[PDB]
Design a protein around this nucleic acid. Structure first.
Ligand SMILES: [Mg+2]
Ligand SMILES: [Mg+2]
Ligand SMILES: [Mg+2]
Ligand SMILES: [Mg+2]
Ligand SMILES: [Mg+2]
Ligand SMILES: [Mg+2]
Ligand SMILES: [Mg+2]
Ligand SMILES: [Mg+2]
Ligand SMILES: [Mg+2]
Ligand SMILES: [Mg+2]
Ligand SMILES: [Mg+2]
Ligand SMILES: [Mg+2]
Ligand SMILES: [Mg+2]
Ligand SMILES: [Mg+2]
Ligand SMILES: [Mg+2]
Ligand SMILES: [Mg+2]
Ligand SMILES: [Mg+2]
Ligand SMILES: [Mg+2]
Ligand SMILES: [Mg+2]
Lengths: 49, 229, 251, 116
RNA sequence: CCGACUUUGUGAAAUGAAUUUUACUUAUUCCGUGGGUCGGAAGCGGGGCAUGCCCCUCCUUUUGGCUCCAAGGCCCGGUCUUACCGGGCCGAUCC
RNA sequence: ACAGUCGACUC
RNA sequence: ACGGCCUGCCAACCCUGGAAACGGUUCAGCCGGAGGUAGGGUCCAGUGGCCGGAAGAGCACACGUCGCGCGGUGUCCGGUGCGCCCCCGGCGGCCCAUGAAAAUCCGGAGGACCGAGUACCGUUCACGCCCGGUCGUACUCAUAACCGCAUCAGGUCUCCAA
RNA sequence: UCCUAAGGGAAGGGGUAACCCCGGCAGAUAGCGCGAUCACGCGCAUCCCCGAAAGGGAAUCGGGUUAAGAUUUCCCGAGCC
């Protein structure tokens, strides 16, 4: 009884990235981890001289 | 123009997902393919005896093409080309009551007919397909040819022989007679063939084929003798 | 006479392993290009209890080397792995606990677990709770290695065989007395129907060689030959000695 | 090749083109309307059903189903069924309750066939 | 349990006039995959103290993130004939 | 830390 | 039943702030510089409240009518609990015992591909239309409908429980 | 009815004198699928069926009614998939 033609979409979803699958505290940490490690990729390339 | 950029993908051992390259080596083939490839592998590994190793020693490319020019000249009669020969003698049989036809000259074929001819010495040249399966049908030919003193060659392709006579497989051909306008150009290929096979029989009957190991095994061998030096 | 309890086990009718709540085989990754010539990072997601086995099992989520999906592999837990740990799999992975390396990358004296025997058989030695193998020496002219196994047996293994660094977790599990027929029964319920065990001396001759007699006694030598036919090879199979072990006899 | 697995190639097949039909005769409709409505049951129970619920109660073929029962009650009687219920009597025959749309009157239909 | 014959082939040595030792890989047995990178040779870097000519490496150690269906360059061809689709190679070393 | 209203029970 | 609005337990989450003279809290735990108390909030459960369904139904009365007539009234107010049954919540505990799988459903990561504004591309929105097949359906479920040669003091799994 | 559990039958194959016995043994595997048909492209990975009226599970409640059906099967009202 989650079927699309039995619940309203606003009642089935949460309006964020990864919502309905990941909570806020988890998605926040994924954002931070992805950003920080992306930064370390290029600081490591710059260390490659 | 400015927006366009390079995005190099690093195809490391833990990097990007590699793309569609050639994996034809590692394909898992049907069992039919698998056994037929392992067939040639095993025929290479094992020591082929001289009788079978006389094969894989075929008539050259130039000599084979030159001989097949003449075999194409002397093709047999088609079916549509065989109906007319019997349909147009109708006037000669119904009215003339005479037979005016002459002897045509064609290449002979079929294992039994050619063996009868060779044993009666009415064969001027014998053409053996190298790739006959089962091989015992043509293993004994070279000795018969050599010791009845008949010029014989082992050309490549039983299908290509079969095309000469319009059958799917032929496995043997022979010329018994040639038109008087092509004797010289026949006897040139006769000289080449007789020099190539009928004289070298008495030394290839001692040569063992096979025993060539795999590429990897040969690589380790080449590694081994260098260290031995 | 009739078929013995020890013969009856070969059919599986009531003697098969109770394998309904087990979590699948516990084994390494498929040996491939990456794991042979480099390293692969896997993240340990959860350490689950596998029913019927003494050791915890570590679910590890690799990324598939050549197609776009994950790989949930399931390793035998080496003491120390915790969720979120990155375990490295391959040849040039550094030597740390939880990593899996070939024996060409593990120095003498290293303690390892879940050892392969034929390179790629996915780990067979030193898997029970709290067991490890000590890598003793390496012969690089053969590409082979030697190891001391939990039994004390010393085995020569190919040097390209993988091995998890560390020892299997759950160590010392068998140190605790169970104190109860209850605990024994719940131990063996999730393993197999091999408990309780009835002393053959308290059977009748028709079903066991030891049975029968006005008194309870074996009757003949309790040690049987190696070649004794099944249904007679019961007791102490091909014993080299008996009696409580003293001195070098227990070495 | 790219994938290291070999799959059976997509061949082409033909649909059947028989040189002679394995059956010549066209199969006759053996579940026609007359085999599918054997006769209206006329016990007092169905009699009361006629007026109290505006339904005709028939004995119908055991291989009939609600779809064919409506389709048949339409071709006979020049009526239509709003709803149909079927049960299998203990005696073996199937009994069907056919409830009419209120445009049609069950008493008039049952008098035009003769039950009461 | 072990012995012989058989599938059971190849060449090599040492002992006697067959015997143990070996070597090979294709028979054979076994193991692993969704037969997904095997063998040789290149090249990118690192060791030079006969510039050797032999070695060591393959662009992921990092924090429970994400990675697919190529960006990029070059060479043809079709076309509005003054406006645009299909090709081939490199990227992804060869054999 | 007082006043008002109520309270089913247990010792 | 169902629909809307409201309420928002016990937990979970958010924002402000910054705690030792440590505080908060449970029957028991336990929680806090990884952010407590405190202030304000979000979410969740519901078998909770109001309205619609729905008083036109049901019931109890009270009359008066020949013949499934009819008419009239009521269907309110609190409170209680170591109470019984059912379900749920969230704690805590035991395990050499960790206590099924799939169908199905939903959510998300990515964004190849696509469109108008005298109009064309979508729309998991509201409303609207049509159809819903086959088989079981009675009764006992037992000191008489089952088995024990029976209308046998025997045996046979359950739900409700003043 | 649908899905799986323990388990059971099975196509290719292996065994068998033959009935019959083995299902992972890997075989161009039973089935191919999806976007497109104005056709083609891409994928194919642990690859079949059966197995529960106590497991999982699209949807229904109230009031009437029979000599015997229905609480939710008929009638009345209101819903749902
Ligand atoms: Mg929402
Ligand atoms: Mg037992
Ligand atoms: Mg014991
Ligand atoms: Mg005992
Ligand atoms: Mg006794
Ligand atoms: Mg005995
Ligand atoms: Mg005894
Ligand atoms: Mg029915
Ligand atoms: Mg608060
Ligand atoms: Mg509610
Ligand atoms: Mg708990
Ligand atoms: Mg019924
Ligand atoms: Mg009933
Ligand atoms: Mg009885
Ligand atoms: Mg009886
Ligand atoms: Mg089923
Ligand atoms: Mg069921
Ligand atoms: Mg059920
Ligand atoms: Mg109705």
């Amino acid at each position: 009884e989650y079927k699309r033609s039995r619940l309203s979409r606003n009642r089935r979803t949460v309006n964020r990235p990864y919502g309905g699958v990941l909570s806020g505290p988890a998605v926040r940490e994924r954002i931070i981890r992805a950003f920080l490690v992306e930064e370390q990729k290029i600081v490591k390339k710059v260390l490659k001289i | 123009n400015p927006l366009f950029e390079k995005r190099p993908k690093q195809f490391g051992i833990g990097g990007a997902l590699p793309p569609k390259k050639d994996l034809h080596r590692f394909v898992k083939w049907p069992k039919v393919v698998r056994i037929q490839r392992q067939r040639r592998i095993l025929k290479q590994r094992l020591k082929v005896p001289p009788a079978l190793h006389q094969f894989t020693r075929t008539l050259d490319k130039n000599l084979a093409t030159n001989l097949f020019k003449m075999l194409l000249k002397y093709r047999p009669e088609d079916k549509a080309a065989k109906k007319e020969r019997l349909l147009k003698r109708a006037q000669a049989e119904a009215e003339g009551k005479t037979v005016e036809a002459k002897k045509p000259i064609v290449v002979k074929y079929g294992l039994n007919h050619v063996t009868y001819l060779i044993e009666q010495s009415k064969a001027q040249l014998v053409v053996i397909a190298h790739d006959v399966d089962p091989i015992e049908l043509v293993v004994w030919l070279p000795a018969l040819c050599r010791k009845m003193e008949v010029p014989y060659c082992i050309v490549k392709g039983k299908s290509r022989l079969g095309s000469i006579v319009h059958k799917k497989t032929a496995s043997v051909l022979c010329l018994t007679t040639v038109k008087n306008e092509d004797k010289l150009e026949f006897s040139k290929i006769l000289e080449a063939i007789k020099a190539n096979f009928n004289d070298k029989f008495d030394e290839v009957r001692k040569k063992w084929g096979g025993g060539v190991m795999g590429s990897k095994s040969q690589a380790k061998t080449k590694a081994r003798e260098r260290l031995i030096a | 006479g009739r078929v013995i309890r020890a013969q009856r086990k070969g059919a599986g009718s009531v003697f098969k392993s109770h394998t309904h709540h087990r979590k699948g085989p516990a084994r390494f990754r498929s040996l491939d290009f990456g794991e042979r010539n480099g390293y692969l990072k896997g993240v340990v997601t959860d350490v689950i209890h596998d029913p019927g086995r003494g050791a915890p099992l570590a679910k590890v989520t690799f990324r598939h080397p050549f197609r776009y999906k994950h790989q949930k592999e399931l390793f035998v837990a080496a003491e120390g792995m915790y969720t979120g740990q990155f375990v490295y799999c391959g040849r040039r992975a550094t030597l740390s606990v939880g990593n899996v390396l070939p024996l060409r990358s593990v120095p003498e004296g290293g303690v390892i677990c879940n050892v392969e025997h034929h390179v790629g058989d996915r780990g067979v030695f030193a898997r029970a709770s709290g067991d490890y193998a000590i890598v003793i020496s390496h012969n690089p002219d053969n590409g082979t290695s030697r190891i001391k196994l939990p039994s004390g047996a010393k085995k020569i293994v190919p040097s390209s065989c993988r091995a998890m660094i560390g020892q299997v977790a759950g160590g010392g599990r068998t140190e605790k007395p169970m104190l109860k027929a209850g605990n024994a029964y719940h131990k063996y319920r999730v393993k197999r129907n091999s408990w309780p065990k009835v002393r053959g001396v308290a059977m009748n001759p028709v079903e066991h060689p030891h049975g029968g007699g006005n008194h309870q006694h074996i009757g003949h030598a309790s040690t049987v030959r190696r070649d004794a036919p099944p249904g007679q090879k019961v007791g102490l199979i091909a014993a080299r000695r008996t009696g409580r072990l003293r001195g070098q006899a227990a070495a | 090749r790219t994938s290291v697995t070999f799959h059976r190639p997509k061949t082409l097949s033909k649909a059947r083109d028989p040189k002679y039909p394995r059956i010549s005769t066209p199969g006759r409709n053996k579940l026609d309307q007359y085999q599918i409505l054997k006769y209206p049951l006329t016990t007092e129970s169905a009699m009361k059903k006629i007026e109290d619920n505006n339904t005709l109660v028939f004995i119908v073929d055991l291989k009939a189903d609600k779809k064919k029962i409506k389709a048949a009650v339409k071709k006979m009687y020049d009526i239509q069924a709003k709803k149909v219920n079927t049960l299998i009597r203990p005696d073996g025959k199937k009994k069907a309750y056919v409830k009419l749309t209120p445009d049609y009157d069950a008493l008039d239909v049952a008098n035009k066939i003769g039950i009461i």
